Amino acid sequence: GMDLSRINTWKSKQLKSFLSSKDTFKADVHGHSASYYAIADNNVRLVCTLLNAGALKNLLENEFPLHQAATLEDTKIVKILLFSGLDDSQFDDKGNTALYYAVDSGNMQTVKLFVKKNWRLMFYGKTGWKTSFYHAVMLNDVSIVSYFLSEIPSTFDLAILLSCIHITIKNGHVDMMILLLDYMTSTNTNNSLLFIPDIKLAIDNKDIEMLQALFKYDINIYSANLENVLLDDAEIAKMIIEKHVEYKSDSYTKDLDIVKNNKLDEIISKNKELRLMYVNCVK
Amino acid sequence: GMDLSRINTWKSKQLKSFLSSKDTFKADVHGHSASYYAIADNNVRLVCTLLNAGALKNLLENEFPLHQAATLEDTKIVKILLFSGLDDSQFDDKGNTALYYAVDSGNMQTVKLFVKKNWRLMFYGKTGWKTSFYHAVMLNDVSIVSYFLSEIPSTFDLAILLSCIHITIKNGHVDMMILLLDYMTSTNTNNSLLFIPDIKLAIDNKDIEMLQALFKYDINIYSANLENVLLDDAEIAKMIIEKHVEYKSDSYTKDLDIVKNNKLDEIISKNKELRLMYVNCVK
């Protein structure tokens, strides 16, 4: 019955012997190998000695050393393991990459390490909800996400953008949404209004800073059936009307089919408060 | 059944005749008086004609003209009604002041009007949760709150600060929290660590931007029992330890009793992972 947990305190004689034994790459009574303890203590010298003895040719079915090394602040074991030929896109038993754990541990230097290797790693995961990009968004880690976006090539269109927007609006992360909105605006190649799915959610919560930030951008106020809410809350109704009025005088928007044949003007004309709001927007 | 809803169209003759009648200050079939419709329309000239005929000496129990005028963007009727001697601190049938409705409508000019008159108005309401100040916080209206704080005299300590912080952290309003935190720091006359009740809330949610903003201030990391959470999540545990370590080197904090006799050092020293983190801060 074996216990390796104290391996980092062993001297040469005991380690050398151990590494000669038939036990050297077995898991102990706690279920961990020697590589696991060396990594956990950031024992670079020991890690390498284990690697020199053939530890990576004898990994168990539940051990993912790269994923483990990704939680360390010192990136050296991660460098060593990549040099040894470990695959940076491998999933563990929870469908996560090593990058995911660098995000989850907030190790920026390890995040930058994997992303300089290939930026595509930020979008690998068993599910969309298991990608390093989405997890950064979900954690409201504005630094990591700002960094991720600076590394997406223009040649690429973010697919998972709608799930990100949802969780962001839902949980009130306004700086995050500004980042996502700046990115949508800058990659708006067909020059249309921005489709924000959960604008209804921000209305219902009435987060004034969130709404004010949304309305700074060329958002699609029409494909949300927002005309239904113009008689609901006047402060918000005024923001929508102000936007609509702007869209009717902006050459970028005034001749769009969505603006021309809108169902808002109908509701505005039938009500008196809304009419007041409109004409006060016009100057 | 009498109906006054068109009154804003009436001409002087019909109006002059109605103001002579015994019906002049009754509510109609819809339940509204003439002043109500005039106000709703922002019909300043008609409001004044109604005031001149004695409308304010004949208010019914459910009539709150100032609260109604506060929802208008034009502040003129609010000015008129205050000249006529209406009480700016009166509660309506819901325990709210007129200022509450200026906040709820987002009318900054009306907010500034009531506050220049009497800054204390921002803290009047049936309950703490009905104050204009709390309502602005709950709406995440950072502009209104930023304005309100600039108008609190140093001679005053804000009482409701507790519930404002709760709602802010519960709902992820980082810029709001930053406002409240700068205010707390500015008025920290006892030069103590900041007491932040819902710290455990931001830990459970793991909002990285919220936690990073919280940890920039001299917050009380000790009166939360946080040592409990040091073995839970390593990214967060590391922010706590970094802070604690700084508190032991800062002359502002190192000789505080709460720091000296802390329950964290215990837990730090018993765990290898924790001592790892501790020693890396410590350089």
Mutate which of B140, B148, B180, B241 to disrupt the A interface (most A C-beta within 10 Å)?
B140
CB contact under 8 A, B276 and A71: no
How many Cα atoms sit within 13 Å of A230 on the Cβ side? 29
Across A102-113, b (16+ Cβ under 10 Å) vs e yields bbbbbbeebbeb
CA B167, distance to chain mean position in Å, is 10
Pick B172's closest partner by Cβ from A40, A106, A171: A171
How many Cα atoms sit within 13 Å of B243 on the Cβ side? 23
Query: Helix, strand, or coil here: A219?
Result: strand
Residues B87, B111: contact at Cβ < 8 Å?
no
The structure's method of determination equals X-ray
CA A212 – CA B141 distance, rounded (Å): 9
- Residue of chain A whose Cα is closest to the Cα of B43: A276
Burial grade of A206 (CB within 10 A; 0-12, 13-18, 19 or more): middle
| CA–CA min distance A70, chain B (Å) | 12
CB contact under 8 A, B235 and A106: yes
Pick B208's closest partner by Cβ from A106, A234, A273: A106
Pick A175's closest partner by Cβ from B40, B174, B272: B174
Task: Give the angle B51-B56-B61 at the CA atoms, nearest 5°.
Answer: 145
Burial grade of B20 (CB within 10 A; 0-12, 13-18, 19 or more): exposed
Across A58-84, b (16+ Cβ under 10 Å) vs e yields eeeeebbbbbbbbbbeebebbebbbee
CA A125 – CA A232 distance, rounded (Å): 41
List B219's β-bridge partners, or say none: B194
Who contacts A190 (Cβ-Cβ below 8 Å, separation ≥6)? none
- Residue of chain B whose Cα is closest to the Cα of A235: B105
Residues B65, B59: contact at Cβ < 8 Å?
yes
Virtual torsion, Cα A172, A106, B206, A98, nearest 10 deg: 100
Residues B116, B78: contact at Cβ < 8 Å?
no
Tokens of A256: 């769009």
- Residue of chain A whose Cα is closest to the Cα of B272: A41
For each of the domains in chain B, give its residue range(s) and CATH number, in order of start. 1-283 (1.25.40.20)
E runs forming strands in chain A: none
DSSP string, B215-239: TTS-B-STTTTGGGGTTT-HHHHHH
Give the experimental resolution in Å.
Answer: 2.3
- Which residues on A lie below 8 Å from B171 (Cβ)? 172, 205, 207
CB contact under 8 A, A176 and B105: no
DSSP category for residue A125: S
- Which residues on B lie below 8 Å from A171 (Cβ)? 172, 207
